[PDB]
Design a protein around this ligand. Structure first.
Ligand SMILES: Nc1nc2c(ncn2[C@@H]2O[C@H](COP(=O)(O)OP(=O)(O)OP(=O)(O)O)[C@@H](O)[C@H]2O)c(=O)[nH]1
Ligand SMILES: Nc1ncnc2c1ncn2[C@@H]1O[C@H](COP(=O)(O)OP(=O)(O)CP(=O)(O)O)[C@@H](O)[C@H]1O
Ligand SMILES: Nc1nc2c(ncn2[C@@H]2O[C@H](COP(=O)(O)OP(=O)(O)O)[C@@H](O)[C@H]2O)c(=O)[nH]1
Ligand SMILES: O=C(C1CC1)N1CCN(c2ccc(F)cc2)CC1
Ligand SMILES: [Ca+2]
Ligand SMILES: [Ca+2]
Ligand SMILES: [Ca+2]
Ligand SMILES: [Mg+2]
Ligand SMILES: [Mg+2]
Ligand SMILES: [Mg+2]
Lengths: 438, 54, 425, 352
């Protein structure tokens, strides 16, 4: 058994992290007090769920997690929320004033003064692991902490844990749920300095989650609580292999092996289905072929783009619920003869499939209805470059006028770091075009 | 349409289907970046105080 | 615990500052004696932002009252909520400033400024984490203008990395006390260009026309004009005083409103503005159409003469947040010729459930518009009309000032106009 | 008040559509870079599709289908037909074609020569035509050596296809011609055929014993108006409209344009567009697409219709700009953005 340490940075990472650990507890049968009746080994054990939870002599199952925010209001929800008993104070780190949506402020000004404290708290969790696999890092692109402090933490983790894998769950900025304007700057700055330090990153576009919540859940104006509960389902679908018995994606390294043949191109597209509203009178249960077919509809992608106009480099099908291999292959065959699925010539045209018999768990009173089977597809498409193009264009519009730049220079950043980070994104966009287009 | 590496356990199974075959900065260097930006903040604040002293 | 220190200087600054604490004290359920008497916890959620908590659950505003003559602050102390202010926080002289920027900035004001900073330091030293300062004042007199801008210069020297926002009343020959108002305004504007992160420009003429034309007030008074400023100040600070969509502090708010350090002068607005047909329910379309209408703006500048760099709007009350977005995304996508296209998504909206006293719902407008240059062009034209003849200069040279300093203030303002002009094209 | 942007100042068609949109007083034109638009009259090349449909609250519509180039590229069309089961390699209405890359660069050189040698040995007519999308550059010849050598002298991909040695010749004149049909595909993927076509006729007598002079073989409006000495003799601008052409078929052949030619055309437009529908449909997309196409057909002396090529940004006949442009605003733009007959189109029903 090998352990995974989750790191939640900024408001987005902390609240998303809160939703996931709530979901993990409901899935693993853990109560808010940390007790787990089904765990017959008291105060120890090397079970699959132990990759994410440690155990005390008193039988408490404690998440292997660290929450970091430059301002304490979000993390104070955890300290007093339902699952306050799970964590101890060492795991929750808060400053007194945030980064004001300023990357330079989170990376340099404030980050410099708290980076060593965070590493110390992480070192404590690492010291409880007999074979640490690496880190899962949750954060937003737009926030000054989520963007600026995460890139500093990633550089230091690469130094302090050279041989450890680092996966990201990053929130792509969406105007419909953002009162900020400088988020293109922060996103590009943090992607430039984080690129070489992240082995595999899962980008979730808030715009995509917003429409799925309005469209499939009939939420007129979704809240962060709505978005996070849907996002934590996808996160659970992706981390389930590490927490349950299985043979696919059993360690963090297998994510890069199966989804990232080229290092810089490490942003798999995520598609999830089905998302059924709980308020519905009662929904007809979809089949393996239907939910699998949904995985090629843009409407249920975590990033709105058109994979019909890209090339696949890898494709993973993660099933939960009443699913048997026979039905999977039967559906896959039909989809190939109906869908546009063009692979790169230097990659096999195939699908790795994982099935976990336990159906998706849903939080009581949440918005999602209990379904008998669901699936999450991880596919590395060049079509996700559309998101880099969108974001890079917004950067160019403001940077041509040097708008808002004085806020970053004022915190000690050089203007050259802007153009340096932008030219890196231009190189990233060209890499996608060389791999996908003819 | 081949199925390879079929693994079955109590909580699920996994397999692979093939449809067609194919055809860092050191700790010191980070401290320099952090301190260089800190030094530019100190310089900028000094010019402000020098301005206010005038 | 993100505290704000409030400073009000001079006649205008204290009379407007007083109505401000009267308005929000009511919204937070604080009576004139500092005792809470509300019915919702939302009233106390962010109460420490503007109030200190004393013994016996008393709430004392974190405000500093400053003037060079005792008169106005004697009114405040005897006013409605006069008893709610900390006695030590009254700092005043006897000389007066004679509506002379030089007296407030260099002579009279310099003699008193140190004792004001001692009170400021006292309030700051108690803040868990100081957000920044806010100053209310006029630019046409001597105390709020000359000594206010001197206070800002000394506050920035001692708190260089704290936010400094001001609510600044701009003079107008239509609502004028003295002819030297253009001199005082031009001299203050350059201090604000350098030393404030945000300045809400409140034009006394726009306030007048709103009282006469929209409110149908035959003979407006300063009291009437200040009722509009109180409501506007309560509007812009709503996101700071209550929980809601955005939980940003002054710095994050400034980061997204100010793309250039010198262009930080905002045009505020408020809706509704109804004449006594005052009980009729106001719909979301009406709230939005008015909020963007020039007649609802207090900068007396036609936004259709310039372009918005950034726009913010706060909606208060129980309303359709879905229908809110529909009307906002309708005003933008129907007049995108006045928004700069090189700042993506520069129109932001936020909602707050608590409405102002006696209103089902309302909206406050905050525009960073290049049209504000029309206001500085007015001031500059009136300044040069007198300065070309050195009229009334003796009042200022008698306080140690030299003509050169006037010439520099003139160039600084005209540079400011030239900076707004390039970004409008 | 709807908003649109113009990003192709050279489009005669959408210049009229934009001129009409403004005439309604309900459409406002924005700068070509303002992202807050409802309708994008986009550019031909490198249209930034990835930036469409990401504006909060704005339903956005574009006048080009992302991926339709598969059908509007000389080399792409050939590949699509041979590799698409819906069209198969035995497609009866498309001339035998081969993709041939210049030697200075898969390629079907050997496949072409195998079919060429078969024709030469069987006494059959062995005349082919080499062309490419990078042309105003066409060569007609009966020798395989000349065709391949002509391509190697160039540096872009070409296509060699069979030349219709038995074209239907109009009388009087004994002259070649082609047929242009405009087809509009709306956001719902309804296929509308404009009721008005045009025959771009050659004002020169067809001569099968001299492919060197390409003025009687190529019916391009620019070639006839440049290298032809009888331009405008029989019809104004070498443009015969369906009314006349139909009247001719009745007097000469005792048949109608509908039965003899139009049925095959409608069938070809359907087969082509239904084929690529799964690849370019914007049904479940975050933005909506529509596009105007220009199909070019050839008719032989047996009255069999052959598909020549498909144009992605076609121009219209001067006499038909008003009626067609208005038709685009009715079914393509106003259908998505309504304003405050007897259709000029022919809805080709089909299964989605
Ligand atoms: N999905 C989701 N997105 C969030 C959430 N909270 C904030 N965001 C997004 O994150 C971006 C803002 O960055 P934040 O994470 O709030 O800022 P931060 O990381 O705390 O850094 P600071 O600037 O110091 O506050 C916006 O694009 C928000 O829409 C959340 O709970 N869920
Ligand atoms: N296989 C073939 N048999 C007979 N004629 C042919 C032919 N291929 C092309 N042509 C002739 O060439 C002309 C059109 O050529 P083509 O369409 O390939 O070039 P082009 O695309 O630049 C003209 P446009 O795009 O305007 O239709 C027609 O008038 C037709 O007579
Ligand atoms: N809105 C408003 N403006 C005022 C008020 N009092 C004065 N003014 C304006 O402010 C300027 C005079 O400045 P004043 O505050 O009296 O000078 P000070 O006391 O020395 O700071 C003139 O332009 C007045 O029109 C007031 O109560 N409300
Ligand atoms: O500078 C300030 C505060 C000192 C008053 N503000 C400007 C930005 N405002 C804003 C409104 C809606 C919105 F969506 C985002 C920001 C609120 C107030
Ligand atoms: Ca155990
Ligand atoms: Ca590494
Ligand atoms: Ca004295
Ligand atoms: Mg934050
Ligand atoms: Mg006065
Ligand atoms: Mg062509």
């Amino acid at each position: 058994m090998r352990e995974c340490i989750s790191i939640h940075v900024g408001q987005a990472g902390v609240q998303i992290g809160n939703a996931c650990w709530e979901l993990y507890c409901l899935e693993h049968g853990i109560q808010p007090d940390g007790q787990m009746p089904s765990d017959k080994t008291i105060g120890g054990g090397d079970d699959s769920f132990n990759t994410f939870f440690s155990e005390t002599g008193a039988g408490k199952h404690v998440p292997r997690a660290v929450f970091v925010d430059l301002e304490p209001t979000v993390i104070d929800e955890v300290r007093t929320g339902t699952y306050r008993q799970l964590f101890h104070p060492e795991q929750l780190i808060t400053g007194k004033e945030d980064a004001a949506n300023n990357y330079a402020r989170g990376h340099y000004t404030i980050g410099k003064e708290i980076i060593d404290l965070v590493l110390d708290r992480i070192r404590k969790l690492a010291d409880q692991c007999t074979g640490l696999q690496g880190f899962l890092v949750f954060h937003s692109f737009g926030g000054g902490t989520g963007s600026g402090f995460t890139s500093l933490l990633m550089e230091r983790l690469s130094v302090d844990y050279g041989k450890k894998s680092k996966l990201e769950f990053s929130i792509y900025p969406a105007p419909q749920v953002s009162t900020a304007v400088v988020e293109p700057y922060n996103s590009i700055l943090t992607t430039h300095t984080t690129l070489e330090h992240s082995d595999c990153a899962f980008m979730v576009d808030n715009e995509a989650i917003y429409d799925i919540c309005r469209r499939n859940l009939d939420i007129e104006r979704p809240t962060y609580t709505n978005l996070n509960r849907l996002i934590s389902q996808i996160v659970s679908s992706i981390t389930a292999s590490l927490r349950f018995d299985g043979a696919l994606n059993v360690d963090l390294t297998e994510f890069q092996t199966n989804l990232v043949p080229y290092p810089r191109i490490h942003f798999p597209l995520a598609t999830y289905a089905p998302v059924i509203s709980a308020e519905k009178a009662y929904h007809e249960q979809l089949s393996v072929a239907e939910i699998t077919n949904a995985c090629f509809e843009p409407a249920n992608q975590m990033v709105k783009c058109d994979p019909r106009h890209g090339k696949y480099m890898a494709c993973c099908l993660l099933y939960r619920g009443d699913v048997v291999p026979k039905d999977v292959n039967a559906a896959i065959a039909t989809i190939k003869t109906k869908r546009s699925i063009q692979f790169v010539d230097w990659c096999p045209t195939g699908f790795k499939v994982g099935i976990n018999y336990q159906p998706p768990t849903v939080v009581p009173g949440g918005d999602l209805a209990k379904v008998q089977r669901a699936v999450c597809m991880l596919s590395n498409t060049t079509a996700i470059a559309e998101a880099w193009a969108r974001l890079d264009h917004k950067f160019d519009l403001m940077y041509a006028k040097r708008a808002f730049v004085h806020w970053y220079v004022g915190e000690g950043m050089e203007e050259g770091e802007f153009s340096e980070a932008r030219e890196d994104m231009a190189a990233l966009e060209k890499d996608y075009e060389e791999v996908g287009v003819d | 349409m081949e199925v390879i590496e079929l693994n079955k356990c109590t909580s699920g199974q996994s397999f692979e289907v093939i449809l067609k075959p194919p055809s860092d900065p050191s700790l010191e260097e980070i401290q320099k970046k952090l301190e260089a930006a800190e030094e530019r903040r100190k310089y900028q604040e000094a010019e402000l105080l020098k301005h206010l002293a005038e | 615990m993100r505290e704000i220190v409030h400073i009000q200087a001079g006649q205008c600054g204290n009379q407007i500052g007083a109505k401000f604490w009267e308005v929000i004290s009511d919204e937070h359920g604080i009576d004139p004696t500092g005792s809470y008497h509300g019915d919702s916890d939302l009233q106390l959620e962010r109460i420490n932002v503007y109030y200190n908590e004393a013994t016996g659950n008393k709430y004392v505003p974190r405000a500093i009252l400053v003037d060079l003559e005792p008169g106005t602050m004697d009114s405040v102390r005897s006013g409605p909520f006069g008893q709610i202010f900390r006695p030590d926080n009254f700092v005043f002289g006897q000389s007066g400033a004679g509506n002379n920027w030089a007296k407030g900035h260099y002579t009279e004001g310099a003699e008193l400024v140190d004792s004001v900073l001692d009170v400021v330091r006292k309030e700051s030293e108690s803040c868990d984490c100081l957000q920044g300062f806010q100053l209310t004042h006029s630019l046409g007199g001597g105390t709020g203008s000359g000594m206010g801008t001197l206070l800002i210069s000394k506050i920035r020297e001692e708190y260089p990395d704290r936010i400094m926002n001001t609510f600044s009343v701009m003079p107008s020959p239509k609502v004028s006390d003295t002819v030297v108002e253009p001199y005082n305004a031009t001299l203050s504007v350059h201090q604000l260009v350098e030393n404030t992160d945000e300045t809400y420009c409140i034009d006394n003429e726009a306030l007048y026309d709103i009282c006469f034309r929209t409110l149908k007030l035959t003979t407006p008074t300063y009291g009437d004009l200040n009722h509009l400023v109180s409501a506007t100040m309560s509007g812009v600070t709503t996101c700071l005083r209550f929980p809601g969509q955005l939980n940003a502090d002054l710095r994050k708010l400034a980061v997204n409103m100010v793309p250039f350090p010198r262009l930080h002068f905002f045009m505020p607005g408020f809706a509704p503005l109804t004449s006594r047909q005052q009980y009729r329910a106001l719909t979301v379309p009406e709230l939005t159409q008015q909020m963007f209408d020039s007649k609802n703006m207090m900068a007396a500048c036609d936004p259709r003469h310039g372009r918005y760099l950034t726009v913010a709007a706060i909606f208060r009350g129980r309303m359709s947040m879905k229908e809110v977005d529909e009307q906002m995304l309708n005003v933008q996508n129907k007049n995108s010729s006045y928004f700069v296209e090189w700042i993506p998504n520069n129109v932001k909206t936020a909602v707050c459930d608590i409405p102002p006293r006696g209103l089902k719902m309302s909206a406050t407008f905050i525009g960073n518009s290049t049209a504000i240059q029309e206001l500085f062009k007015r001031i500059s034209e009136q300044f040069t009309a007198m300065f070309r003849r050195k009229a009334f200069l003796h009042w200022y040279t008698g306080e140690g000032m030299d003509e050169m300093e006037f010439t520099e203030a003139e160039s600084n303002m005209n540079d400011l106009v030239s900076e707004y002009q390039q970004y409008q094209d | 008040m709807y908003t649109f942007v113009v990003r192709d100042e050279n489009s005669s068609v959408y210049a009229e559509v934009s001129r009409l949109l403004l005439a309604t007083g309900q459409w406002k034109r924005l700068r070509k870079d303002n992202p807050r638009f409802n309708l994008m009259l986009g550019e031909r090349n490198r249209l930034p599709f990835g930036r469409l449909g990401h504006e909060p609250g704005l339903v956005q519509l574009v006048n080009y289908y992302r991926g339709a180039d598969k059908l509007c590229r000389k080399a792409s069309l050939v590949k699509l037909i041979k590799t698409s089961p819906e069209l198969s390699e035995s497609c009866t209405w498309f001339p035998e074609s081969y993709v041939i890359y210049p030697t200075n660069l898969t390629d079907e050189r050997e496949v072409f020569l195998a079919a060429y040698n078969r024709r030469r040995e069987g006494r059959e007519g062995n005349v082919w035509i080499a062309k490419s999308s990078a042309g105003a550059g066409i060569l007609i010849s009966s020798e395989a050596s000349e065709l391949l050598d002509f391509i190697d002298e160039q540096g872009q991909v070409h296509v060699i296809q069979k030349y219709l040695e038995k074209p239907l010749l109009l009388e009087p004149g004994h002259r070649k011609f082609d047929i242009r049909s405009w087809v509009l595909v709306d956001h719902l993927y309804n296929i509308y055929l404009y009721r008005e076509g045009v025959l771009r006729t050659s004002s020169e007598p067809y001569n099968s014993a001299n492919f060197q002079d390409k003025t009687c073989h190529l019916t391009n409006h620019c070639i006839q108006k440049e290298y032809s000495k009888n331009y405008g003799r029989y019809e104004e601008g070498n443009e015969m409209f369906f009314e006349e052409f139909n009247q001719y078929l009745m007097d000469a052949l005792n048949t109608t344009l509908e039965n003899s030619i139009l049925l095959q055309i409608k069938h070809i437009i359907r087969s082509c567009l239904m084929c690529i529908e799964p690849a370019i449909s914007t049904k479940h997309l975050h933005y909506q697409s529509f596009q105007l196409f220009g199909f070019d057909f050839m008719v032989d002396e047996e009255l069999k219709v052959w598909l020549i090529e498909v144009n992605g940004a076609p121009a219209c006949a001067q006499k038909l700009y008003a009626e067609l442009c208005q038709g685009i605003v009715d079914v393509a733009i106003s259908s998505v953005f309504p304003l405050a007959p007897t259709s000029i189109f022919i809805k080709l029903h089909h299964h989605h």
